[PDB]
Scaffold this active site. Structure first.
Site, PDB file in Angstrom:
ATOM      1  N   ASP A 189     -14.001 -15.885  14.607  1.00 59.59           N
ATOM      2  CA  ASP A 189     -14.140 -17.321  14.833  1.00 59.59           C
ATOM      3  C   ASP A 189     -13.748 -18.157  13.593  1.00 59.59           C
ATOM      4  OD1 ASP A 189     -16.578 -16.722  13.367  1.00 59.59           O
ATOM      5  OD2 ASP A 189     -17.914 -17.512  14.935  1.00 59.59           O
TER       6      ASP A 189
ATOM      7  N   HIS B   4     -17.889 -32.553   9.391  1.00 62.14           N
ATOM      8  CA  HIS B   4     -18.577 -31.340   9.796  1.00 62.14           C
ATOM      9  C   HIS B   4     -19.883 -31.617  10.506  1.00 62.14           C
ATOM     10  CE1 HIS B   4     -15.823 -29.712   6.687  1.00 62.14           C
ATOM     11  NE2 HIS B   4     -15.777 -28.687   7.532  1.00 62.14           N
TER      12      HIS B   4
ATOM     13  N   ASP C 245       0.808  -1.206   0.000  1.00 60.57           N
ATOM     14  CA  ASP C 245       0.000   0.000   0.000  1.00 60.57           C
ATOM     15  C   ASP C 245       0.856   1.277   0.000  1.00 60.57           C
ATOM     16  OD1 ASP C 245      -2.994   0.928   0.589  1.00 60.57           O
ATOM     17  OD2 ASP C 245      -1.596   2.178   1.707  1.00 60.57           O
TER      18      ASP C 245
ATOM     19  N   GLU D 201     -21.409 -16.419  12.358  1.00 60.02           N
ATOM     20  CA  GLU D 201     -22.597 -15.555  12.293  1.00 60.02           C
ATOM     21  C   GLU D 201     -22.234 -14.180  11.687  1.00 60.02           C
ATOM     22  OE1 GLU D 201     -21.158 -16.749  15.051  1.00 60.02           O
ATOM     23  OE2 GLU D 201     -20.347 -14.889  15.837  1.00 60.02           O
TER      24      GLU D 201
ATOM     25  N   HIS E 240     -10.725 -20.579  13.834  1.00 53.48           N
ATOM     26  CA  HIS E 240     -11.046 -21.957  13.423  1.00 53.48           C
ATOM     27  C   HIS E 240      -9.982 -22.529  12.481  1.00 53.48           C
ATOM     28  CE1 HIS E 240     -13.865 -25.280  12.008  1.00 53.48           C
ATOM     29  NE2 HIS E 240     -12.985 -25.211  11.023  1.00 53.48           N
ATOM     30  N   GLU E 241      -9.658 -21.768  11.445  1.00 57.30           N
ATOM     31  CA  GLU E 241      -8.794 -22.282  10.407  1.00 57.30           C
ATOM     32  C   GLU E 241      -7.345 -22.311  10.896  1.00 57.30           C
ATOM     33  OE1 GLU E 241      -9.620 -24.023   7.855  1.00 57.30           O
ATOM     34  OE2 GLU E 241     -11.788 -23.810   7.898  1.00 57.30           O
TER      35      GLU E 241
ATOM     36  N   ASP F 187     -18.799 -35.762   2.963  1.00 61.92           N
ATOM     37  CA  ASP F 187     -18.140 -34.829   3.892  1.00 61.92           C
ATOM     38  C   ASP F 187     -17.025 -35.558   4.658  1.00 61.92           C
ATOM     39  OD1 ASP F 187     -17.691 -32.458   5.535  1.00 61.92           O
ATOM     40  OD2 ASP F 187     -19.118 -33.225   7.023  1.00 61.92           O
TER      41      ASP F 187
ATOM     42  N   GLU G 222     -22.048 -19.905  18.407  1.00 59.00           N
ATOM     43  CA  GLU G 222     -22.271 -20.187  17.005  1.00 59.00           C
ATOM     44  C   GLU G 222     -20.998 -19.882  16.207  1.00 59.00           C
ATOM     45  OE1 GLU G 222     -26.274 -19.968  15.870  1.00 59.00           O
ATOM     46  OE2 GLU G 222     -26.301 -20.847  17.939  1.00 59.00           O
TER      47      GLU G 222
ATOM     48  N   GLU H 248     -12.945 -16.011  19.933  1.00 56.02           N
ATOM     49  CA  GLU H 248     -14.003 -15.011  19.914  1.00 56.02           C
ATOM     50  C   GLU H 248     -14.291 -14.429  21.298  1.00 56.02           C
ATOM     51  OE1 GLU H 248     -17.313 -15.526  17.133  1.00 56.02           O
ATOM     52  OE2 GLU H 248     -18.599 -15.102  18.870  1.00 56.02           O
TER      53      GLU H 248
ATOM     54  N   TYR I  93      -8.106 -36.341   8.909  1.00 61.71           N
ATOM     55  CA  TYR I  93      -9.306 -35.625   8.551  1.00 61.71           C
ATOM     56  C   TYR I  93     -10.336 -36.543   7.879  1.00 61.71           C
ATOM     57  CZ  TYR I  93     -11.838 -31.241   7.632  1.00 61.71           C
ATOM     58  OH  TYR I  93     -12.757 -30.196   7.634  1.00 61.71           O
TER      59      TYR I  93
ATOM     60  N   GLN J 182      -2.638   3.587   4.691  1.00 61.22           N
ATOM     61  CA  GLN J 182      -4.055   3.725   5.045  1.00 61.22           C
ATOM     62  C   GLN J 182      -4.908   2.696   4.295  1.00 61.22           C
ATOM     63  OE1 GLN J 182      -3.748   8.464   5.227  1.00 61.22           O
ATOM     64  NE2 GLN J 182      -5.871   7.709   5.375  1.00 61.22           N
TER      65      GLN J 182
ATOM     66  N   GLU K 281     -12.343 -31.207  13.391  1.00 59.00           N
ATOM     67  CA  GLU K 281     -13.369 -30.112  13.259  1.00 59.00           C
ATOM     68  C   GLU K 281     -13.891 -29.495  14.563  1.00 59.00           C
ATOM     69  OE1 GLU K 281     -14.449 -28.044  10.924  1.00 59.00           O
ATOM     70  OE2 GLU K 281     -12.929 -28.748   9.556  1.00 59.00           O
TER      71      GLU K 281
ATOM     72  N   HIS L 219      -6.741 -25.467  12.891  1.00 59.56           N
ATOM     73  CA  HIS L 219      -6.301 -26.618  12.083  1.00 59.56           C
ATOM     74  C   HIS L 219      -4.781 -26.685  11.919  1.00 59.56           C
ATOM     75  CE1 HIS L 219     -10.052 -28.302  10.915  1.00 59.56           C
ATOM     76  NE2 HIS L 219     -10.473 -27.192  10.332  1.00 59.56           N
TER      77      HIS L 219
ATOM     78  N   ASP M 150     -28.713 -16.093  12.279  1.00 54.17           N
ATOM     79  CA  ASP M 150     -28.291 -17.403  11.759  1.00 54.17           C
ATOM     80  C   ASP M 150     -26.751 -17.583  11.746  1.00 54.17           C
ATOM     81  OD1 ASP M 150     -28.047 -15.579   9.607  1.00 54.17           O
ATOM     82  OD2 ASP M 150     -28.739 -17.021   8.093  1.00 54.17           O
TER      83      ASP M 150
HETATM   84 CA   LIG Z   1     -26.924 -13.689   8.678  1.00 54.71          CA
HETATM   85 CA   LIG Z   2     -19.281 -17.006  16.828  1.00 54.01          CA
HETATM   86 CA   LIG Z   3      -3.967   3.101   1.000  1.00 54.86          CA
HETATM   87 CA   LIG Z   4     -20.161 -13.340  17.613  1.00 51.78          CA
HETATM   88 ZN   LIG Z   5     -12.491 -26.805   9.934  1.00 51.51          ZN
END
Ligand SMILES: [Ca+2]
Ligand SMILES: [Ca+2]
Ligand SMILES: [Ca+2]
Ligand SMILES: [Ca+2]
Ligand SMILES: [Zn+2]
EC number: 3.4.24.27
Length: 316
Positions: free
Chosen positions: A138, A231, A57, A190, A142-143, A226, A187, A177, A157, A61, A166, A146, A200
């Site tokens: 999250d 999962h 950059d 989300e 999460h990733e 899967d 969750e 989080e 896996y 900024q 998982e 792993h 959700d």
């Molecule tokens: Ca949503």
């Molecule tokens: Ca969450």
């Molecule tokens: Ca910039």
């Molecule tokens: Ca949250």
């Molecule tokens: Zn995963």
């Protein structure tokens, strides 16, 4: 890149402004020198060739909407690094301060994020199912979790060990989080899932069956989709982790909750000291009981709650 450490400012996916560690050499690069051997964020430029170009950059900024997913990938990698260091005394994912690398703008309309064995990769989503996946701390944690698993237990896996792999990532992503402490919950995803619908997510740990996932062993998926349900079946272990932490009565079995910090301690220890590549659910139970015993003693509430939580999900 060789140059000086600087501090930039930008905006994340959800419009929050944040400071980011950068490196200056002609341009300002998303290279954070303050943590281990560095955190590096790259632009995949809507292609699938990896890693792409170290993010450059002109003015330090990062407020263009194009910048936002890089801002979040860079910043949340840093939060996850600090979580493992301050809470578990673990330095990066290999325990030896390995560079953490992430690419954003992977492919076009890609509704997913993954660790590829060497780095993090985030899609931008299709704007409908998902917005850019690095906007969810999250998801980022999460990733990266792993990567932690791959360097420690190395759970394969597939089938049960896969569902454990998982679950561990859902558990530690949730704990990150809570550690960062901005609207935490039980969750997954989300913040980046369906900008058109409130409340959700991809998955629930407190109530897996909300989204079709088993919450008891008698309901395990035994087909081949899967990777044998990695999962889907993670829901059984997620619910156990939720019960250990929060407490509750689940199919008539009562569990005294011990809180998030002890849940983290117990599962981190099981992961790094007791699980192996081929561990199944019942071996996860023994590892977690032995973990709680090393940490809290054999007569403890902690041990008693671990056994109760695995009883509640049908895992003996
Ligand atoms: Ca949503
Ligand atoms: Ca969450
Ligand atoms: Ca910039
Ligand atoms: Ca949250
Ligand atoms: Zn995963």
């Amino acid at each position: 890149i060789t140059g000086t450490s600087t501090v930039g400012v930008g905006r994340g996916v959800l419009g929050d402004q944040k400071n980011i560690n950068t490196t200056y050499s002609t341009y300002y690069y998303l290279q954070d020198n303050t943590r281990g051997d560095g955190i590096f964020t790259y632009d995949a430029k809507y292609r699938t060739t990896l890693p792409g170009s170290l993010w450059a950059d002109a003015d330090n900024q990062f407020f263009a909407s194009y910048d936002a997913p890089a801002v979040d990938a860079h910043y949340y990698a840093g939060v996850t690094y600090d979580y493992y260091k301050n809470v578990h005394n673990r330095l990066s994912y290999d325990g030896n301060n390995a560079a953490i690398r992430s690419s954003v703008h992977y492919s076009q309309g890609y509704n997913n994020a993954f660790w590829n064995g060497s780095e993090m990769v985030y899609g931008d989503g299709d704007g409908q199912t998902f917005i850019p996946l690095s906007g969810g701390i999250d998801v980022v944690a999460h990733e990266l979790t792993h990567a932690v698993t791959d360097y420690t237990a190395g759970l394969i896996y597939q089938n049960e060990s896969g569902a454990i792999n998982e679950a561990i990532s859902d558990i530690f992503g949730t704990l990150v989080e809570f550690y960062a402490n901005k609207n935490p919950d039980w969750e997954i995803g989300e913040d980046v899932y369906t900008p058109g619908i409130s409340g959700d997510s991809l998955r629930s740990m407190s109530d897996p069956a909300k989204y079709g996932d088993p919450d008891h062993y008698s309901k395990r998926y035994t087909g081949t989709q899967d990777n044998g349900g990695v999962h889907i079946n993670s829901g059984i272990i997620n619910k156990a982790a939720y019960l250990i932490s929060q407490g509750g009565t689940h199919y008539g079995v009562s569990v005294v909750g011990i809180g998030r910090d002890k849940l983290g301690k117990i599962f981190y220890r099981a992961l790094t000291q007791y699980l192996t590549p081929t561990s199944n659910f019942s071996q996860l139970r023994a590892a977690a009981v032995q973990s709680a015993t090393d940490l809290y003693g054999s007569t403890s509430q902690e041990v008693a709650s671990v056994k109760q939580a695995f009883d509640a999900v049908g895992v003996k």
